[PDB]
């Protein structure tokens, strides 16, 4: 996702974490504001453009070598690659936070976890085809862009009504309501099935496989004849919106559950 998507995920997570988890995270981050997670949720996307952070570019993706829309699937050993991926990064940075939460690596580990759990939920962050749809040029509200970009940015910004941190906070409030009492309330109790702090690869792969199913059902199901030739701000956006909204919600809810496990101690 772009910045709005990441900040939205982070604000949702803030709404679900336990107080002890909040305190654990605020201490690591040096920030006890009511935007403590949201304020770091875009860091990985700036860091990757620097010489020191170049190595972390592949950590935003798992390039699933499936055959969408006919068939979708993610396989860790097949898809991660030698340079690492979102799944291997979740394992690395989660383990840093379990083993050395007071060390010098915890800060960036936590910022990575907050970001990357968001990215795992962007279906085209879990898809090899045309570099996750970057190579699929499209038209969106008259502008030339690509399919990856509209999932990261154009569509969630349109739905949220903007791109800023405050717009993200308002959007997060909306989606949080959907989880607690609204649209998602009767299904969110299954959204952490399979979660296991002792197995970050298994856990994150469940989430990645879930998001990747939407590459076939939603992202590419209209077929490339339609996608290449139709302005995607109309009916395409209409069908995409419930999907990216539920995935952003899932990302925040799952992020919060994961942070709770990271911070947890038996009293
Ligand atoms: C774990 O994270 C550290 C710090 O970013 C990095 O140096 C290291 O290569 C990572 N290890 C793996 C296996 O990804
Ligand atoms: C759509 O564009 C992609 C990317 O350039 C191409 O691989 C695909 O064949 C195109 N399909 C049609 C129908 O133009
Ligand atoms: Na521990
Ligand atoms: Zn992103
Ligand atoms: Zn992206
Ligand atoms: Zn990213």
Author numbering: 21 to 287
Task: Please give the exact wording used by the authors of the publication that reports this structure.
S1 nuclease from Aspergillus oryzae (EC 3.1.30.1; NCBI sequence ID: XP_001818636; S1–P1 nuclease family in Pfam, PF02265) is an extracellular, single–strand–specific, sugar non–specific, Zn2+–dependent, fungal nuclease with 3'–mononucleotidase activity with a pH optimum in range 4.0–4.3. The active site is located in a surface cleft and composed of the obligatory catalytic trinuclear zinc cluster supplemented by Lys68 and the nucleoside binding site 1 (NBS1; also called Phe site in the previous studies). A cluster of three zinc ions coordinates the substrate/product scissile phosphate and the reaction mechanism utilizes water activated by Zn2+ ions as a nucleophile.
Coordination of the zinc ions is completed by four water molecules W1–W4. This structure represents a possible resting state of the enzyme.
